[PDB]
Amino acid sequence: PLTVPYDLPLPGGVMPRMLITIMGTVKPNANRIVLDFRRGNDVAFHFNPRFNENNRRVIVCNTKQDNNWGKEERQSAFPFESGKPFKIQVLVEADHFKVAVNDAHLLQYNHRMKNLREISQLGISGDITLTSANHAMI
């Protein structure tokens, strides 16, 4: 029963073997979900499921620097469903972020902003109810 948008502190930034876990329910008639791994006002990793982009479901990933978006990465595999519970797991590794949804691998996003110690906040927003958010070293 967390309030969305929710800011999860990542003190000391991210590092290899850090695992972030987000639990919630997609609202009925959802349009999008956003997880923003922020470096101050910049976004090192934007993970953005879209439920109705031109009548299709897609995952868009990108990086924002100085208010401008970089080149998009796109994935047709879409494990979310309107009205249903979900579990997002983000594993940080030396070269990328690895994302799994409902315990199944979804995608990898290579680090563009390499100073991992400065990625100190995760913003969770969009058309969801949020149950829990945590991070641990595994």
Ligand X SMILES: OC[C@H]1O[C@@H](S[C@@H]2O[C@H](CO)[C@H](O)[C@H](n3cc(-c4cccc(F)c4)nn3)[C@H]2O)[C@H](O)[C@@H](n2cc(-c3cccc(F)c3)nn2)[C@H]1O
Residue 4 binding partner per list Cl ion, ligand X, none, with a CB distance cut-off of 5 to 8 Å that depends on partner kind: none
Least Å distance between CB 48 and Cl ion? 7
Cβ proximity to ligand X: between 46 and 111 the closer is: 46
Closest CB to Cl ion among residues 24, 126: 126
Number of other CB atoms surrounding residue 47 within 10 Å: 25
Long-range contacts of 96-105 (CB under 8 A, 24+ apart): 97/37, 97/45, 99/47, 104/79
Query: Minimal distance in Å, beta carbon 69 to Cl ion?
Result: 12
Provide, rounded to whole angstroms, the least separation between the CB of residue 54 and ligand X. 3
Q: Are 128 and 36 in contact (CB under 8 A)?
A: no
Region of residue 66 (left: phi > 0; alpha: psi -120 to 50; beta: else) = left
57 appears as a binding residue in the annotation: no
Facing residues of 126 across strands? 33
Residue 32 is labelled as binding a ligand: no
Binding-site residues for a beta-D-galactoside: 69-75
Binding site for Cl ion (CB under 5 A): 50
